[PDB]
Amino acid sequence: VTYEKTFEIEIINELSASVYNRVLNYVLNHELNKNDSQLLEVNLLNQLKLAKRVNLFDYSLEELQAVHEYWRSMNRYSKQVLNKE
Amino acid sequence: AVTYEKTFEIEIINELSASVYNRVLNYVLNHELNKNDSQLLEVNLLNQLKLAKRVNLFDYSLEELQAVHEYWRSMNRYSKQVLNK
Amino acid sequence: NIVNFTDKQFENRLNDNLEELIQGKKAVESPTAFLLGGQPGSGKTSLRSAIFEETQGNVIVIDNDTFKQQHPNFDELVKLYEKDVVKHVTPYSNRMTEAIISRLSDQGYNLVIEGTGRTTDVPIQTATMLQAKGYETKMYVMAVPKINSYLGTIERYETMYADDPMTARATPKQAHDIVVKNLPTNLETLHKTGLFSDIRLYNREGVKLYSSLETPSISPKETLEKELNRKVSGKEIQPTLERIEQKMVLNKHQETPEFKAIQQKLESLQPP
Amino acid sequence: ANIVNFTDKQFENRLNDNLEELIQGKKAVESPTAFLLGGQPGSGKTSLRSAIFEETQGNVIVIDNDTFKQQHPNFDELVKLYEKDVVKHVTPYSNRMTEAIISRLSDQGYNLVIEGTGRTTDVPIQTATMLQAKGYETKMYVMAVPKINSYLGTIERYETMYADDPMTARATPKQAHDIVVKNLPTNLETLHKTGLFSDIRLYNREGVKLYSSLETPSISPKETLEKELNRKVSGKEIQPTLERIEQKMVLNKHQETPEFKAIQQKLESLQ
Ligand SMILES: CC(=O)N[C@H]1[C@@H](OP(=O)(O)OP(=O)(O)OC[C@H]2O[C@@H](n3ccc(=O)[nH]c3=O)[C@H](O)[C@@H]2O)O[C@H](CO)[C@@H](O)[C@@H]1O
């Protein structure tokens, strides 16, 4: 438990929640079938689900930084795909 | 039935997806990681890709295909960066 | 009125939340709940770590803030109230937090309930409600110097802004100061209630500084005050100042009172 | 040995995964059909995959030799050495893999799409015969596409992949394209004569059937293919393709190539 790692974990939690919620909201709002991985946005939701399953407390800084940049990437990407009305 | 425009994307997506997925596959097999332990960062990535690769591309709009093109550019960027220890 | 939402919209999000939270966790015959305390910026995620270890990973973290953006009409609410969106989506997040605590405690999973310790009554009602379901209730609090936590809020904000400008919201100074002011007295109060089998103080580095179980006649009040009021050496804040400047430069936030403060402090610490 | 080689265990592992991916949502059938693909590079043989996906209603497995190139255990090390001239070195691997996949998957009798160009009579004949003595019906669907359009296709493909990954990109040699074009009409007639195929089809870029040996058993695929291969393309039709590659080549920063300079003189002759 270094503050450096604790801090990164705090930031990752907030960002991953933001991204997940944008995807969850859109999937729910557009009434998309959660059990259909063929549907692009659902596939993405399922991918985010796997990502969140990990115990971040078992990661090193380099691994945490890697996870962080994962969520920057999905944040960027999710905004791009969700353009329906 | 199908356009050149869309099929050209699919062809590109395929070569690219194979390139990204194989990088991750190579890393996982060569570093002898338990493919069943989705807690491992590199194995969690693989599993997401197994998930993204599991779609029928012939059933997407051109808009959707471009989104999927954009996804595999992300994973390309990300995979290279994360297996770059 | 976009601030409202249907009961179904709630049920759907409640159901997803529950799936997510029970993943890999297991309800037990003798569940524990760990309520958290500490001012904004104190690094309470450190507490989650210790509890994860203590429960061998069989714990569910419940965190109000992760629900705010889950409001069904969230994106329509920022495009209307912008920076001030938090107060409009709190009713949703509150109702969601409570529903989730209710259901998970119905089953009997181990819980971590994130919170600041701004009051005694909220942790009290929570502990009391959980006890009526067979939970042992503990309280784990962060003891962190007021200057370290305040720098923590700043850094958090600027690191978030660098990831996403829309998503980032500054912690207001009051939210930080009120908890610093209330906490020590609130802990002595909670101590006297006897509801908590253990009250613990941890520091930034994860070191347990106090335990009501181990020293049941010493109150937590003084130990926490020593730490909130500890004078922090120039040499101790420097790395944090350096990281803040780095993000602030990147975010083009040079023209703030904060940045000029941080820049002056960093110049005063240079080897003459 | 060393970097170019790989242990049987290493191959074994990658085979297991490949098979695992490929079987996803597929059943084995009792009349398994193998579709062997044909067409010069840049044809757009992906068009065929969609026609076959439709024909088999999703229960078909695509075996594409290219998708194994980067799967060589040591590939990483083989770029720190050979960079853009790496393809040659890994082809041994990818050929072995494909043949083990085609092998194990045909033991179980899944419907198969096998990626090919039709440069040789040897390969499809050898494949078709191997598969028939195993219960497979064997067909051959081939792109019938103007040489100018397919040559432009190779150019576009490379230019798009350069924009994806400036390191992975390597163009198809014009001679490699032009050989399949010179050989294919005659190769299809030789195949026609073997009677190994229940149907040889010619498809244009829009998925439109131009020929079927089953429909027209005494007509050669040869005349019909040559005619499309050689068909001259109007400035009308070639207008967008040129514009698109041109604008992609500015981002890739490739003005100073004979290919780009030849586009300018086609775009100038039509203004
Ligand atoms: C997808 C593919 O393979 N074609 C590639 C091959 O062209 P090429 O013209 O070599 O493609 P072919 O159709 O001849 O097949 C190549 C190899 O794939 C395997 N195979 C193919 C067909 C078949 O029915 N059975 C079979 O086992 C064989 O090992 C064969 O030797 O190299 C070119 C570079 O020069 C690439 O641009 C092509 O993408």
Residue numbers in the entry:
A (entry chain A): 3 to 87
B (entry chain C): 2 to 86
C (entry chain B): 3 to 274
D (entry chain D): 2 to 272
Study text:
Almost all prokaryotic genomes encode toxin–antitoxin (TA) systems. These loci consist of bicistronic operons that encode for a bacterial toxin and its cognate inhibitor, which neutralizes the toxin under dormant conditions. The epsilon/zeta and the PezAT system form similar heterotetrameric complexes in which two antitoxin molecules inhibit two toxins. In conclusion, we have demonstrated that zeta and PezT toxins are UNAG kinases that form UDP-N-acetylglucosamine-3′-phosphate (UNAG-3P) from UNAG using ATP and Mg2+ as a cofactor. We further showed that the formation of UNAG-3P yields a potent inhibitor of the enzyme MurA, which synthesizes the first committed step of bacterial cell wall synthesis.
Once bound to the antitoxin, side chain groups of the antitoxin block the ATP binding site. The second substrate binding site, however, remains unaffected by the antitoxin. Thus, we surmised that PezT and zeta toxins are still able to bind UNAG even if they are inhibited by the antitoxin. Indeed, we could determine the crystal structure of the epsilon/zeta TA complex from S. pyogenes bound to UNAG at 2.7 Å resolution. UNAG binds to a deep cleft at the molecular surface of the zeta toxin. The side chain group of Asp67 forms a hydrogen bond (3.2 Å) to the 3′-hydroxyl group of the amino sugar moiety of UNAG. Based on superposition with structurally related phosphotransferases, this particular side chain of the zeta toxin had been suggested to be the catalytic base, which deprotonates the substrate. Thr118 of the zeta toxin formed a hydrogen bond with an oxygen atom of the β-phosphate group of UNAG (2.8 Å), and exchange of this conserved residue in the PezT toxin to a valine residue also yielded a nontoxic variant. Additional specific contacts between the zeta toxin and UNAG are electrostatic interactions of Arg120 with the phosphate groups of UDP. Apart from van der Waals interactions, specific hydrogen bonds are formed between Thr128 and the uracil base and between Glu100 and the 2′-hydroxyl group of the UDP ribose.
